[PDB]
Amino acid sequence: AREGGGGKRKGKSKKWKEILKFPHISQCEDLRRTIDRDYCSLCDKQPIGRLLFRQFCETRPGLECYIQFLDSVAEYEVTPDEKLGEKGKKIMTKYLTPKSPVFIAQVGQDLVSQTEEKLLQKPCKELFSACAQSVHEYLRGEPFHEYLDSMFFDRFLQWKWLERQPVTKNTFRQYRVLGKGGFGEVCACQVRATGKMYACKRLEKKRIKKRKGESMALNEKQILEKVNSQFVVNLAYAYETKDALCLVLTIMNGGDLKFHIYNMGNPGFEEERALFYAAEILCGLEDLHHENTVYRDLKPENILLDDYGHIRISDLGLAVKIPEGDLIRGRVGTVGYMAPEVLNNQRYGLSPDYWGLGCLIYEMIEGQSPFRGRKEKVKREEVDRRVLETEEVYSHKFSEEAKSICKMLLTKDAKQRLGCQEEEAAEVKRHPFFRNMNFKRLEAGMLDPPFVPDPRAVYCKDVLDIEQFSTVKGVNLDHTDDDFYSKFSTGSVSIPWQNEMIETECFKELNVFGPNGTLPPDLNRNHPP
Ligand SMILES: Nc1ncnc2c1ncn2[C@@H]1O[C@H](COP(=O)(O)OP(=O)(O)NP(=O)(O)O)[C@@H](O)[C@H]1O
Ligand SMILES: [Mg+2]
Numbered sequence: 001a002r003e004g005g006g007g008k009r010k011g012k013s014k015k016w017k018e019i020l021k022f023p024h025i026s027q028c029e030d031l032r033r034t035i036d037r038d039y040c041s042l043c044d045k046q047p048i049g050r051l052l053f054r055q056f057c058e059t060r061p062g063l064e065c066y067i068q069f070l071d072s073v074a075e076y077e078v079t080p081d082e083k084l085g086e087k088g089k090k091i092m093t094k095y096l097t098p099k100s101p102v103f104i105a106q107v108g109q110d111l112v113s114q115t116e117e118k119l120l121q122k123p124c125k126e127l128f129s130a131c132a133q134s135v136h137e138y139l140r141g142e143p144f145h146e147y148l149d150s151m152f153f154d155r156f157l158q159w160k161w162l163e164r165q166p167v168t169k170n171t172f173r174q175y176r177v178l179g180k181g182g183f184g185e186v187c188a189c190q191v192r193a194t195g196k197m198y199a200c201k202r203l204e205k206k207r208i209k210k211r212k213g214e215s216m217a218l219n220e221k222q223i224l225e226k227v228n229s230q231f232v233v234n235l236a237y238a239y240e241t242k243d244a245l246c247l248v249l250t251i252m253n254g255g256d257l258k259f260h261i262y263n264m265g266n267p268g269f270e271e272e273r274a275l276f277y278a279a280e281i282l283c284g285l286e287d288l289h290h291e292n293t294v295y296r297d298l299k300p301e302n303i304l305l306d307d308y309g310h311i312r313i314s315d316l317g318l319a320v321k322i323p324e325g326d327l328i329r330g331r332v333g334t335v336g337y338m339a340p341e342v343l344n345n346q347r348y349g350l351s352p353d354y355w356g357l358g359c360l361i362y363e364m365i366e367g368q369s370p371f372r373g374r375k376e377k378v379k380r381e382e383v384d385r386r387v388l389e390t391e392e393v394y395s396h397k398f399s400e401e402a403k404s405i406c407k408m409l410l411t412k413d414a415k416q417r418l419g420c421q422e423e424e425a426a427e428v429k430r431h432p433f434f435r436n437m438n439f440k441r442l443e444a445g446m447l448d449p450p451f452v453p454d455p456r457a458v459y460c461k462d463v464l465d466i467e468q469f470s471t472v473k474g475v476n477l478d479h480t481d482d483d484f485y486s487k488f489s490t491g492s493v494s495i496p497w498q499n500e501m502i503e504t505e506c507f508k509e510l511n512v513f514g515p516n517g518t519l520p521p522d523l524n525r526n527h528p529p
Contacts, residue, residue: 002503004307006188006197006251007175007455012504019193020162020510022522024529028157035160037148039140045228048159048498048507053144056152063143065102066135069095073128077440084123091128092116106138107131125440151513154523159507163498167239167491169467172200177460178253183207183217184244185464188251194504198236200466201247205481208245214484220317221247221488227291228495230445231284232313233304236496239468240489246466252312254305254453257364261300262374267367271399272450274364277303277311279437281357284313286425289350293321294328298356299337300363309449322349335380336372336387340412343384351414354428358409358418361433365397370410388412405433 013019035042043053057063072091079087095104096112111134118127147153175188175197183203190197208217224235224247237248257277261267281303288295297318304314318332327347331338339355341348362370370392372383392410394403408418408431419428429439441447470489473482501507514520521527 001505001508003196006190006199006253008190008195008197009175010173010190010195012195012506013192016193016506017510020506022155022158022510023161025154025158025523025525026528028154028161031157031160031164035157039136039144042153042156043139043144043147044136046494046498047502049156051502051507052152052156052159052511053147056147056150057143060143063139065095065104066106066139066143068102069104070132070135073132076128077125078438078444078446080438081125084125084127085119088119088123088127092119096131104135107134151519151523155511155513158522159498159501159511163492163494165492167237167468167489169469171237171468172248172466174200174463174466177458177462178251178456179458180460180462183211183213185460185462187463187466188253189248189466191500194500194506196500196504197251198248199251199253201249202241202464202466203245203247205243205245205485209481214481216317217245218484218488219319220315223291223293223316223319223321224249225493226321227288227293227316229284229287229312230443231280231311232287232316234496235493236500237492238488238490240470240485241465241467242469242471243465245485245488246468250306250312252304252306252314253456254307254309255456256305256314257300257303257311257360259456260305260453261364261367264367267374268363268365268397269367270450271365271402274361274402275433275437276447276450277364278357278361279434279439279442280311281313281360282425282428283439283443284311285353285357288313288319289353289424291321292324292350293319294348294350295319295353295356296333296342297337298353298360299334300360303360305453307453307455309452310445335383336369338384338387339414340388341414343388348414349420350424351417351420354409354417354419355414357428358406361402361409362392362406365402365406366395367397370406399433401431401433401435405431 042049044050054067057067072095076084076087076091092115094100094102096107096115097103111131115127115131171191172189173192175190178186178188178199180186184201184207186199186201188197189200203217208214221235221238224233228234233252234250235247237246239246261269285295295313295318297315302313302315303311305311320328322328327349329345329347331342331345333342337356337359339352342352359370368374371386371390372378394406398406405418411417414420418431419425421427428434471485473479473486512520
């Protein structure tokens with residue numbers, strides 16, 4: 001039911017209900033046979049799967065109490081710190097006390113006792129996390145298996161059938177160019193059936209080939225697909241055209257952070273703004289780091305605003321998923337934004353991203369990078385020398401807390417850097433610079449940005465072809481490029497496609513069952529087409 005524009009001038013297709021018409025259930029047999037029946041994926045991570053599992057649970061008063069609990073815990077997490085004691089006590093009384101009618105017995109009383117004791121002490125936002133996990137361990141059992149046998153999972157297969165339909169020349173319509181650079185250009189585009197607006201990043205095949213950017217283009221695609229964060233650009237579709245590869249991404253047309261820092265004419269902006277952006281960037285980093293993925297490229301150009309003034313981390317090409325327990329090596333990044341441990345070509349973890357966060361907070365407030373001026377003629381090896389050998393200084397533009405968090409993130413030794421300890425991001429979140437920020441509310445979108453941007457408008461009369469075309473492969477004995485094109489163009493990406501259906505209310509309007517006897521014709525096995 002959520003929507004905002006990329007400037008969506010046309011709405012859904014008048015024929016959208018035909019385009020998105022469910023297959024008869026008899027056409028889902030191959031899906032039924034091949035689908036991995038994995039509770040976490042099917043009933044939680046996949047948005048439509050989560051919705052249909054909950055619809056199933058609400059038909060059973062005995063399962064519905066578990067869903068209510070999980071929803072209460074969600075409410076608890078965003079409760080103001082001072083009121084957690086009351087909200088927690090209410091949850092305890094309602095769900096975790098056998099006297100109550102909505103009592104949930106499958107949370108072990110040893111877990112309840114643990115929770116009751118933590119609740120006596122200083123309550124924290126994560127108080128109920130162990131209980132919640134216990135609930136899912138129950139639900140992934142018999143309730144899940146009942147779900148798989150219900151009309152709600154049948155309906156899930158129908159949605160999955162739709163999801164996996166190919167991207168074609170008719171899937172999108174094209175709007176104006178948003179920007180140009182890198183391997184290509186970015187233009188606005190819209191899914192015809194749903195009306196949802198996206199950015200289409202068009203990578204020219206000839207430019208990828210010349211610069212040998214195949215592995216990086218593929219890497220960006222694969223990390224984008226696996227990260228689902230409100231603070232990282234999402235990938236909804238990946239496909240091929242004759243001359244290009246297309247990444248269909250979250251449209252972020254509010255302008256990049258480099259533009260906004262230097263648009264002022266008095267570079268740098270108010271601490272309240274920098275605070276908000278830094279908080280969202282941190283959440284984005286935590287989401288990547290949860291996948292043990294190090295970004296490595298933080299800099300203002302790679303942070304984009306949307307029309308609401310929220311931000312996302314963009315440009316994942318240099319990101320790397322680190323194998324668990326390992327460290328990685330490579331000297332990559334932008335000059336002036338590379339951490340000392342990167343410059344020194346040491347083995348490193350997630351730590352460079354905290355250095356990057358310090359660079360960003362510093363630049364947002366000062367209006368200049370810590371180690372270089374924006375108008376300066378300086379060799380890269382000198383910029384590198386400054387980063388290694390000199391300390392940054394702080395003008396009157398910095399509050400004590402801003403100076404402090406910048407110094408702690410710009411700690412040259414990674415071992416002592418803020419955020420790089422046991423606590424990881426938690427240490428950064430509790431810094432005085434952020435003392436007034438409730439990060440759970442921020443994550444949940446409950447905090448309004450202090451600044452709303454003018455939507456970006458570029459003049460470009462070039463409109464490049466983004467119509468899907470599957471090129472004939474293997475024309476040459478060397479088919480390495482073709483292999484790459486095939487690997488890249490996997491079509492729709494599950495979680496964003498499902499969110500697109502939900503946000504545009506295609507799900508709400510299309511997802512309907514029979515009146516009382518409650519089997520609709522598309523689920524009725526006695527009448528195949
Ligand atoms: N999701 C998006 N929504 C809107 N505009 C975007 C989006 N992604 C990128 N852009 C803009 O499109 C332009 C090109 O971006 P990009 O393809 O990353 O090349 P670049 O930033 O100019 N150079 P590079 O350093 O290689 O990333 C820039 O102005 C971006 O801000
Ligand atoms: Mg870029």
